[PDB]
Amino acid sequence: TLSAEDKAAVERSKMIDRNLREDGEKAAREVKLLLLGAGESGKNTIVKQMKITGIVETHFTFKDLHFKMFDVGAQRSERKKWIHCFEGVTAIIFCVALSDYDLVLAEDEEMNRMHASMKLFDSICNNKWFTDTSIILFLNKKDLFEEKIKKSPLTICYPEYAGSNTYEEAAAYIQCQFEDLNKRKDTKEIYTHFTCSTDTKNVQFVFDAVTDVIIKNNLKDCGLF
Amino acid sequence: DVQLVESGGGLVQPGGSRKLSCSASGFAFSSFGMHWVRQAPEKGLEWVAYISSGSGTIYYADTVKGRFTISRDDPKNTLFLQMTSLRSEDTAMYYCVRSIYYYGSSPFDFWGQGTTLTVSSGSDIVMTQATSSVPVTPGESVSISCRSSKSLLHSNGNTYLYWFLQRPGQSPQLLIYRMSNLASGVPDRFSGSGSGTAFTLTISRLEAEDVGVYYCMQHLEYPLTFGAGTKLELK
Amino acid sequence: ASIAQARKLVEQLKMEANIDRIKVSKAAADLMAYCEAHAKEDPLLTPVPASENPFRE
Amino acid sequence: MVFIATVTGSLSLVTVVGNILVMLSIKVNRQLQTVNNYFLFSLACADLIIGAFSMNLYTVYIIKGYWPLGAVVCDLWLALDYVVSNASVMNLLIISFDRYFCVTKPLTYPARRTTKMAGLMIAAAWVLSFVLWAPAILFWQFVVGKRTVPDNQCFIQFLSNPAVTFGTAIAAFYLPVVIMTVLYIHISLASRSRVAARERKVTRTIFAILLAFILTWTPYNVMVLVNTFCQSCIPDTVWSIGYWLCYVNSTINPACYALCNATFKKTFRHL
Amino acid sequence: ELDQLRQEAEQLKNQIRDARKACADATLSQITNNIDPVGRIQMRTRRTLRGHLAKIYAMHWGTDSRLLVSASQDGKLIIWDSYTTNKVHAIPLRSSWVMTCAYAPSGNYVACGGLDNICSIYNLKTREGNVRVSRELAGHTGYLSCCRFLDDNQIVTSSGDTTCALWDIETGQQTTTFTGHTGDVMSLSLAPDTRLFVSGACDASAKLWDVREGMCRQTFTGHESDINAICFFPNGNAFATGSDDATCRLFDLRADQELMTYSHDNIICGITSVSFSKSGRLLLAGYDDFNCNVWDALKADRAGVLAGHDNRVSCLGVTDDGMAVATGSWDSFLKIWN
Ligand SMILES: C[N+](C)(C)CC#CCOC1=NOCC1
């Protein structure tokens, strides 16, 4: 049987087990959101609204819910090698600039920024690690897009566009062209907002969407769904 | 800086009560088990009590069982020994000793300065230090022998033998833990070698600092028992 | 722009191209000699009994 | 007689293999080892008790007409059967309360629900069922001082007395079925997105697991509530059919509860 | 000119390929054909370590072969007494996105790092009785994939910015930077003499680097996808790489060539971890099919299967005395095999 120091080491191991289990219970009550977006897509504005090198982790408590936001924009390395670290996140917050439908990429000419954001959204939404991870989509700079759309038609970006040059039809067209990239329409859902400048109306939307995701995960846990 | 400071001693009438406190500063107190170890004024060390980290297991010596109560308060980093119905046998200098237990840890590594309590007027492992005084000369190699009644070699390979040194006027200091492992901050020259029941502590190239009383403690079973102590003097 | 990249790449290839290479049969014989000379001291190849195995129980 | 024994032994075999497959599926896969599944394990254990011990003795009972075993064992059989069946319904009730709180309090309820409160509500369900049925069934003879139940026929004595059979019937079926119905209707309302496919699928699951419970427990309960007045009205055969439908509920409980989870169907696919 | 240098580079690559093919008289299988096969290797799970509450991404053994560190993405680095399944230490990490961990050969330090671009050095033997951050090494601009101690004061890290770096811990500065890979360097392995180290990257090539001179000596190609793992042979004259194209490969340093390919038709998943046994006769490889495969490293026959995990086997290690194999997986359980 055990000696005295062996018994005290077993007691140490059990105290460590209790502390690990308490820390896991604390960490399981927190919402992890993976922040994703293109270059200069308004991620920083979203981060500032939520608050009021490597991983930039943000913490904010809203309605007695603790949200941890992981910005991975500084990872210039290949995405497929570290994306599986975020398999168990609650949701993906995707930021898309609506005023990028005419701009070209500074890295490579002849490639539209909106098309590059659509390709990135296609890569993230249908990835094999995010088969059932919901996506909260933010369409930033809607006032800029409103001003630009009158001067510049959307048909330079999307040549299949037939609707008018008004804000609402073009904005709903861009929302539909982002929503229809979801292959797994049954297993995951896409929530879309337009980044209102009003205080507590964007983080309110994030709270509502995360409440929906939590209700759906609880339904899948209870066997109802 | 690691410090344990004891307070609460003094002169107590027999049959009375007194509470000793040990204030701990400079280390993570809640992860250390704590011991109270008294020392009679003309006699060797005696173990009194032990409370584990997290207060799970509490052990007492048979002499003080029932009368004494050891407790800890982790947010205030303080250790209490509440002593009731004090006899004249409890006149001693009390020491608060920290000890952590994991694989490869060093228990009994730091000892407090101690507080003085003056009271006016069978199956335990017997550790035997046969010689009580060895006059030594500096620059020499001396051996200190310690014999145990029961074999201290456990089935897991560890021999729970602990060699301590008490310089004159100071607290005891750990030198060797688990028969052969040299404690942190102890000079190279000290070396322990044992064979189950018989153990020797070799001090080559002896220095003036080395003079003092050496105690062997077992840790195999509770109550922990000390030797009578072997005293190294000058000349 | 990329002229120094090309110069450093051809310099690295000139450093890699002038090492001496032994035969593949000789390196294969050396790997065999190491795998046979240390075969007794491999507990995963040859399962030790439950006495000298510390993960016995 | 030949055909009915085969149909009842076939159903009993299906019941035992189903409930042991459920238990084994929560014993072999770590993903299925969740606080919610503990209630399913309790349910499947009560159902396995029914499917091994109850349906076999009751198919002997209607194939011979009388009770061969005797009078000392008959009371213990009735006590065991009634308490595992009421514990089954109580497990369904605490599953409905658990799902209601997991949906209508999505944030806070998973946190404060823990394995000790899951075991507390499982034990509460079992002890409530045992207290409600076993003392009444066993000890009714000792407090009145006689037995009106013939040795040949095995039934409980108190189904002549209106008060005790109505209090038991309310506290065992009717109150739990209206509680389950109210909670499930609120679950089906509270699952629609507030931020219709999800609501459609969960409402189909609710309708299935509620229609199964009603179609398998209602006949016997209403024959209990008519036999306390007109004992003569109900024939032996229709009585036996209602008793057997209450047994059938334990056979269909894994399909309506466990198999709606896709992980359970993947583990059931794996032998 | 640019074109002239590109032509010279192509000529030198043809020279290297012809010199490699010139000293390729026989294959490894043509000489090992006469030795005995190792037979069926059956290893049973002896110890399961049930302490992690999320995917384990790395594990490293101590030199004493008893203690093992393990890093998971719950933010916890756990030191384990593998003989008793105890927990010696649990270290909370500042960044929970740890992708690697290392155990110092002296046993005094551990290291970890990951998506935070920082290699953190933790001191285990302090007077305060807890584990504190002794150092944080920054300077990498991509995620840190693998770290390995040389001694107490020197560490070698390989990051996702296509570079490796040799750090002096007590100053905190990169002593040496190893450049030359054109993809994300995913793993490294130190030689037993700790003078050369190999690194496998996401350009399907491995490189051998001299620690003292900071230069790439040899480049090994042959894989068709990202090299996720690499490990030296125990004598230091060969190494084995695991990749995403479901093949392991044994390369030789002195012959500058691939020696053996370990692949089976029924295997399509990628390798995440390779290691050798103590003699080098067995090559153990963790796959994405939730199983570990034990290969006869001299005959390329699948000698055995270690099938005990419910998710991808992310990490794998063999003790210094060769007594046990520890596998760590994404389902949060380390297992000791023997
Ligand atoms: C015994 N039987 C399965 C036939 C029905 C019964 C019973 C006791 O428990 C309950 N009564 O009604 C609902 C539960």
CA distance E203 to A10: 47
State whether A16 and E186 contact (CB < 8 Å). no
Angle ∠(E317,E319,E323) on CA atoms, nearest 5: 120
Instruction: Tell me the residue type at B228.
Output: A
The domain in which residue B33 lies consists of 3-119
Comparing C-alpha atoms, which of A221, A88, A189 is closest to residue D101? A221
Closest Cα to atom 6, ligand 1: which residue? D82
**Sole residue written with tokens 């016997």:** D220
Cα B225 from Cα B47, distance rounded (Å): 7
Cβ-Cβ contacts under 8 Å, E331 against chain D: 30
Q: In chain C, how many domains are there? A: 1
Do B93 and B165 lie in a common domain? no
Among residues B61, B92, B119, the one where a domain terminates is B119
Q: Tokens for A121?
A: 């959204």
User: How far apart, in whole angstroms, are the C-alpha atoms of residue A174 and residue D218?
Assistant: 55
- Closest by CA to E152, choosing from E102, E198, E116, is E102
Ligand 1 neighbour D59 (Cβ under 6 A):
no
In whole angstroms, give the CA distance from residue D167 to residue E68.
Answer: 63
Q: Domains in chain A, please, with CATH?
A: 30-218 (3.40.50.300)
CATH tag for E2-337 (out of 3.40.1190.20, 2.60.40.10, 2.130.10.10, 1.10.10.10): 2.130.10.10
Q: Domain count of chain B?
A: 2
Q: Looking at residue D40, which CATH number applies to its domain?
A: 1.20.1070.10
Coil vs helix vs strand at B14: coil
* Token pair listed for A102: 């005419």
The rounded distance, in Å, linking the Cα atoms of A117 and A114 is 5
Minimal C-alpha gap between B129 and chain E (Å): 31
Query: Any idea how long chain D is?
Result: 271
Instruction: Tell me the two tokens of residue E111.
Output: 């290291």
Closest CA to ligand 1's atom 10:
D86
**DSSP class of residue E143?**
-
Burial of B39 (0-12, 13-18, 19+ CB in 10 A): buried
Chains A and B touch (3+ CB pairs under 8 A): yes
- Cis, bond preceding B75 (omega within 30 deg of 0): no
Distance (Å) of CA B2 to CA B167, D14, E99, E126: 19, 69, 35, 11
Residue of E nearest to A54 (CA): E116
In chain D, the number of structural domains is 1
Q: Are E87 and A17 in contact (CB under 8 A)?
A: yes
Shortest-distance atom of ligand 1 to CA D247: 3
Taking the CA of residue D243 as reference, the ligand 1 atom at the shortest distance is: 4
C-beta neighbour count of C37 within 10 angstroms: 11
Q: Where are the domains of chain E?
A: 2-337
The set of long-range contacts for D131-139, using a CB threshold of 8 Å and a minimum separation of 24, is: D132/D86, D132/D168, D132/D171, D132/D172, D133/D79, D133/D82, D133/D83, D133/D86, D133/D168, D133/D172, D134/D79, D134/D82, D134/D83, D136/D164, D136/D168, D137/D75, D137/D78, D137/D79, D137/D82, D138/D75, D138/D76, D138/D79
**8 A C-beta contact, residue E169 and residue E153:** yes
Any atom of ligand 1 within 6 Å of the Cβ of D85: yes
Q: Are B15 and B91 members of one domain?
A: yes
**Same domain for B22 and B111?**
yes
**Residue D228 contacts by C-beta under 8 Å, 6 or more apart in sequence?**
D159, D160, D161, D162, D165, D166
Co-location of B30 and B103 in the same domain:
yes
- Cα dihedral E255, E256, E259, E265 in deg (nearest 10): -170
Method: cryo-EM
Integer Cα distance of E300 and E29 in angstroms: 8
Mutate to test the interface with A, among B29, B50, B101 (most CBs of A within 10 A): B101
Do chain C and chain D touch with ≥3 beta carbon pairs under 8 Å?
A: no
State the distance from the centre of ligand 1 to the C-alpha of D127, rounded, in angstroms.
15
If asked whether residues B107 and B10 sit together in one domain, one would say yes
Distance between CA A145 and CA A193 in Å, rounded?
Answer: 15
Contacts of C45 in chain E (CB under 8 A): 38, 41, 277, 279, 281-282
Strands E248-252 and E257-262: antiparallel
CATH number at residue B139: 2.60.40.10
Rounded CA-CA distance D186/C8 in Å is 72
3-class DSSP assignment, residue D165: helix
Q: Which domain holds residue D181?
A: 2-136+152-269
Rounded to a whole number of angstroms, the distance from the CA of E55 to the nearest CA of chain D is: 14
Residues B138 and B105 in one domain: no
